[PDB]
Structure formats: structure tokens, C-alpha cells
Amino acid sequence: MSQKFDVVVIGAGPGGYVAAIRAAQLGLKTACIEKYIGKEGKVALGGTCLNVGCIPSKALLDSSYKYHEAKEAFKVHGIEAKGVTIDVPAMVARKANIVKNLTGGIATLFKANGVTSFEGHGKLLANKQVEVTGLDGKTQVLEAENVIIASGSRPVEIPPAPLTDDIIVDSTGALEFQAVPKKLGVIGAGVIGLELGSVWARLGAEVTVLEALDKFLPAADEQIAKEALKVLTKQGLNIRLGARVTASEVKKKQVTVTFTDANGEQKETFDKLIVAVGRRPVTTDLLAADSGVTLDERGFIYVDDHCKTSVPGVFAIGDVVRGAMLAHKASEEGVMVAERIAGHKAQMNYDLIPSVIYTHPEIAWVGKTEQTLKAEGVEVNVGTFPFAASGRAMAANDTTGLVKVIADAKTDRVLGVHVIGPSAAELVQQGAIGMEFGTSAEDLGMMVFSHPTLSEALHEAALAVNGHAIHIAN
């Protein structure tokens, strides 16, 4: 029985580790297999998000912002912070210690819940048998009643900019720089590139972001994206749209990138270059030829709306399957799959998954953009409120940005909430909770919002939908 489990989970990222905990909570005998070696030379749980993704990036964003504010936005308060500096090794070490604590915390949760951990590489064979290759190279086979595949993702590689020495790096290396890159190039103006560029720009890097697409943040609401581009450019992110990298050359501890833009061939030289074009699903040695599990043309594991693969009792969740490649999407899929194995008719809502970009100002949204609703032919009413009119934001010395609420013009149902500014993600979550209950704009308007709080900007934007905000002209 040592080798028999009700649920075997391959991977311990946000998808897999949450699925494993939930399965154990539901009374299923659960194993979770993980191969990733952390900084101490031992297996570290938590996946991309904890080890080289969400948490490390937010740690560096928060440290670098605190330095930036001390250097550039203290005098208005009367604060004199003389000769303020930030030590990059110490900043990175704080991040490493946070990662170590949280990865240890997952192991603590596994122990408390009775999840059995295996260290090594898992491979799905036919008929729900899972071969585990341990760290010593020895194999064993686990007999699973159900398998949850949660093998995650890795950075996209591009031929013009292969990882090279410590000069051309991906996001993992960008979270490990021990000195500020004097000239930093970033390929890709999506969330990851914008966050990483912001960290290092705050510390003095001169940053160019090369983006092949003509449109900035095309999935975000256009009004939000336009303000974001303006603000981030002013902060020193030299974001170049319609700029397609074709070659790179490393010499003298620098890298020269050749790229094509509207004016032809261009060259620019950097001390470090981050390739942040996107993310790809990981299926390396994951599926035996006889497993029965199929991949789509983009390399994701094919699953249905309940994350079931083509093989009964085999599920796949998170970044290895279709849908938004986000940590909270992966974890909610894990919960849904575990609940369904336990017999519950659990159903995931894919329409209210929020997005957050942890720049400062923060950017977040839920639901549909104005441009999507126009393409769908839905008439809408829009309300906005700027943080420049927020008393709380004035006290905070942080008045950039706005809240936008989009409602159906016929029914008043809120269809999207979009924010750039302080506490964007928390205000968007307020909107998402309302949308879960079918809120109208008038419903939000009729609620008591504490004063003074940043939340009031959502209240006013909801009132503005129907032309009766108090604190701005309508």
C-alpha cells in the first residue's frame, strides 16, 4: 500500500500543491511529486510562483519602490533621508529568505494535511501508473486512482537572443542580479517585462523595453493601457512598440541587439538583456508514449472545461493547460479537480479571474474591456473617477490613475472594472465580489463606502456610470 494513492499530483506549484492539500482535506490518500531544487540544494515546493515568479518579483518590487519613494518623494512630507542607498545583494537576500520561509511553509502544510511528498521527476504511464525517478536516479511506480498533472511552465526562448553567460537572461536570472545593470534591455512589454524593468529602473538602470506588437497591453482596457504607457515611460521605461528583435551579439560583457522598427534597422547595446516574450507549458518527459494524454498544437495538455484529459481519472491544471496562465487560476483549478474527484459538482468561474500588474501605479482589472464589448456589439455606460480627486490618495501623496466601471446600458449590470493606481488589485477584488453576485452599477452606488479610503474611487466611478458621482463633474 506504500505505493497506492487515491490522488497522485505531479508538480507542487500553485496548481499542484493546492490540489494536493484540498484532496487530502477531502479524505483522499494523496501524494505530490516535485523535482525542483531550491537554493539550499534540497527540493523546494511552491513552483514557479514561489521560487522564481510571483513572490520574488513582488519582494523586489516592494523593496525597490521603498527606495524610490525615499529618494524621490519624501521632501514633500518634510522628510530628509540623506544619502539614501540600496545594497542589491542585501535586497536580493531578503527575497531569498522570504522564498525559503514560504517554501518551508508548504512542506508544513503538507505534513499537517497528511500529503505524502516524493522528491524527483514524475512521468505518467498508461493506466494511471506514475513513475517517480528519485534524486538518486532510482525509479519506483505509484499506482494512482486519479492523477493531477500540474507541471507548469517555463520562459519562451527565442533564436535571436539565446541565454548566454550571465548577460542574456530570462526572468529567473533577472531576479538574481547582484548589481544594478547600467543599461538594461527587456524583450517583451508584458506584465513580466514591465515589472522586472521597473525594479531595476528604480535603482538607476537605464531601461529599454522592445515590444514586437504595435499595441501596448492589448488585453487591458485601452484607456488604462494608454495611461499606463504614459506613466511608465515617464518613470524611465523606454517602451518601444512595433520593435522586432532579429539578432544579438555578446562582446566585452555587453550585448548589442538588432531590431526592426517603423524607421528600419536599429541597434542598441545593453549590459544585461532579459528575454520576457512569454511562457510555454512544460511537458518534458512528463507523458510516456502509452499514457493516452494528448497535447494541442501549442503544446498544452488538452483538457475539457473541468480539466479532465482524454484519459479517465487523469486531470491537468494550471499553466500546462488552456486558460489564463496565472497562479490563482491554477490553484482554483486544483481545488475544482480535487472536489470533483471527491464527488462534488464543483464548477469554476473563468469569467471573473482578475489580472494584476504590480508596477507602481499598480494595474488591475476583472471582466471585459471597453474594446471587447464594442467588438461584441454591447452598448455600455462607462464611469470613471481619478485618484487626483481622492482625499485619501492626496493624503498618501499618490494621485496617479483612475478607476473605470463599465456597465450594460440596458440592464446596468457591471461588465468590467479596471484600475490603475493605489490598491488597484484590492479595488478590483471589490468589483469582482460584486460581479459574482450580479451587481449593477447602481447597487455599488447605493452602498456605504468608508471615508477616507481608496475604495471610494470605486464608489464614485460606479455612480458616474449613471451620471451622478458627487465629487467630479458628470
Ligand X SMILES: Cc1cc2nc3c(=O)[nH]c(=O)nc-3n(C[C@H](O)[C@H](O)[C@H](O)COP(=O)(O)OP(=O)(O)OC[C@H]3O[C@@H](n4cnc5c(N)ncnc54)[C@H](O)[C@@H]3O)c2cc1C
Mark the segment that binds ligand X (CB under 6 A) among 61-69, 89-97, 156-164, 322-330: 322-330
- 343 lies in the site for a copy of itself, by CB under 8 A: no
Residues 6+ apart with CB under 8 A from 437: none
- Nearer CB in complex with a copy of itself: 146/439: 439
360-379: contacts with a copy of itself (CB under 8 A): 364
- 325 lies in the site for ligand X, by CB under 6 A: yes
Cβ atoms 320, 151 nearer than 8 A? yes
* Residue 468 near which of ligand X, a copy of itself, none (CB within 5-8 Å, type-dependent): a copy of itself
- 413 lies in the site for a copy of itself, by CB under 8 A: no
Q: How many other CB atoms are found less than 10 A from the CB of residue 92?
A: 18
Give me the least distance between CB of 252 and ligand X, in Å please. Answer: 28
**Residue 327 marked as a ligand binder:** yes
- 27 lies in the site for a copy of itself, by CB under 8 A: no
Cis before 452? omega within 30:
yes
Q: How far apart are alpha carbons 390 and 457 in whole angstroms?
A: 7
Cis before 361? omega within 30:
yes
Q: How far apart are alpha carbons 157 and 274 in whole angstroms?
A: 11
DSSP-derived 3-state class of residue 55: helix
- 282 lies in the site for ligand X, by CB under 6 A: yes
142-161: contacts with ligand X (CB under 6 A): 150-153
Nearest to 155 by CA among 318, 278, 52: 278
Cβ atoms 38, 51 nearer than 8 A? yes
- Nearer CB in complex with a copy of itself: 291/455: 455
Task: List, as one string, the DSSP characters of 220-251.
Answer: S-HHHHHHHHHHHHHTTEEEESS-EEEEEEEE
**Residue 319 marked as a ligand binder:** yes
Selecting among 451, 459, 468, 471, the annotated active-site residue is 451
**Residue 15 marked as a ligand binder:** yes
Specify which residues 472 forms β-bridges with: none
Task: List, as one string, the DSSP characters of 405-424.
Answer: EEEETTT-BEEEEEEESTTH
DSSP-derived 3-state class of residue 146: strand
Give me the least distance between CB of 412 and ligand X, in Å please. Answer: 28
Q: Report strand pairing: 153-155 vs 279-281.
A: antiparallel
* Residue 122 near which of a copy of itself, ligand X, none (CB within 5-8 Å, type-dependent): ligand X
Mark the segment that binds a copy of itself (CB under 8 A) among 127-135, 212-220, 303-311, 391-399: 391-399
How many chain residues interact with ligand X (CB under 6 A)? 37
- Nearer CB in complex with a copy of itself: 81/247: 81
Active-site annotation holds for 451: yes
Give me the least distance between CB of 369 and ligand X, in Å please. Answer: 19
Positive or negative: CA dihedral 298, 152, 277, 355? positive
Q: How many other CB atoms are found less than 10 A from the CB of residue 235?
A: 16
Mark the segment that binds a copy of itself (CB under 8 A) among 171-179, 264-272, 402-410, 448-456: 448-456
DSSP-derived 3-state class of residue 166: coil
Mark the segment that binds a copy of itself (CB under 8 A) among 79-87, 167-175, 225-233, 276-284: 79-87
Specify which residues 316 forms β-bridges with: 149
The one among 30, 248, 440, 455 contacting a copy of itself by CB under 8 A: 455
Q: How far apart are alpha carbons 370 and 225 in whole angstroms?
A: 12
- 83 lies in the site for a copy of itself, by CB under 8 A: yes
Residues 6+ apart with CB under 8 A from 311: 128, 291, 292, 293
Amino acid in the structure at residue 386? P
x-or-dash string of contact with ligand X, 402-441, rule CB under 6 A: ----------------------------------------
The DSSP letter of residue 404 is E
The one among 117, 256, 258, 429 contacting a copy of itself by CB under 8 A: 429
**Residue 193 marked as a ligand binder:** yes
- 141 lies in the site for a copy of itself, by CB under 8 A: no
The one among 1, 2, 41, 101 contacting a copy of itself by CB under 8 A: 101
Nearest to 257 by CA among 313, 212, 295, 214: 212
Mark the segment that binds ligand X (CB under 6 A) among 107-115, 222-230, 320-328, 391-399: 320-328
Amino acid in the structure at residue 367? G
- 474 lies in the site for a copy of itself, by CB under 8 A: yes
- 13 lies in the site for ligand X, by CB under 6 A: yes
- Nearer CB in complex with ligand X: 373/424: 424
**Residue 453 marked as a ligand binder:** no
Q: How far apart are alpha carbons 234 and 294 in whole angstroms?
A: 46
* Residue 78 near which of a copy of itself, ligand X, none (CB within 5-8 Å, type-dependent): a copy of itself
What Cα–Cα distance (Å) separates residue 416 from each residue in 221, 329, 367, 455, 469? 9, 18, 4, 16, 18
Element (H, E) at 138: none
The one among 34, 221, 332, 370 contacting a copy of itself by CB under 8 A: 332
Binding site residues, ligand X, CB under 6 A: 10-16, 33-36, 47-49, 53-54, 57, 121-122, 150-153, 171, 192, 282, 286, 318-319, 325-328, 330, 358, 451-452
Which residues are designated catalytic?
451
Binding-site residue numbers for NADH are: 192, 195, 245, 278, 356
